[PDB]
Design a protein around this ligand. Structure first.
Ligand code: GDP
Length: 145
């Protein structure tokens, strides 16, 4: 019965990934850990690159992070999902980051809400560093399945 869970935080460069790790540590290093309700959630900051290694794919739960101010950020999340996680035993969560900024329409063929519903993912979770613990509990909860 594991109580320590690993989560890969994946998204476009400067989409607010490091903010998510710092938020878990309680703020407004590419790994961050803290207790979640007692469970331990270990986040991994996966920098944007050309491809992902099989060491960056394995985890207990995936946190796909896209930027609501960057219309090109969700396409990356959707592409990575279908390539590495759509055909996997790994639960996935999509987070609409920088929520406090204005939501410009994402340039993808499918809406985020539709895309999530299409692949049995929870609806897109809004998040900002300006911090709630909601996503980390859900990430941990989804890891406990
Ligand atoms: N408005 C807003 N800006 C943010 C938030 N989180 C991060 N940023 C800004 O986004 C920029 C890049 O974020 P960063 O953490 O470096 O993302 P990363 O490069 O993917 O790790 C930073 O200069 C932050 O000021 C947020 O929740 N709200």
């Amino acid at each position: 019965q594991r109580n320590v869970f690993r989560c890969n935080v994946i998204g476009v460069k400067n989409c607010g990934k490091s903010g998510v790790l710092q938020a878990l540590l309680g703020r407004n290093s590419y790994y961050a850990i803290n207790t979640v309700y007692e469970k331990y959630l270990l986040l991994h900051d996966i920098s944007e690159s050309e491809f992902l290694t099989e060491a960056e794919i394995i985890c207990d739960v995936v946190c796909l992070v896209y930027d609501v101010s960057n219309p090109k950020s969700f396409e990356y999340c959707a592409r990575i999902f279908k390539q590495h996680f759509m055909d996997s035993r790994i639960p996935c969560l999509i987070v609409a980051a920088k929520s406090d900024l204005h939501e410009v329409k994402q340039e993808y063929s499918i809406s985020p809400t539709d895309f999530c519903r299409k692949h049995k993912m929870p609806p897109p979770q809004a998040f900002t560093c300006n911090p709630s613990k909601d996503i980390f509990v859900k990430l941990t909860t989804m890891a406990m399945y």
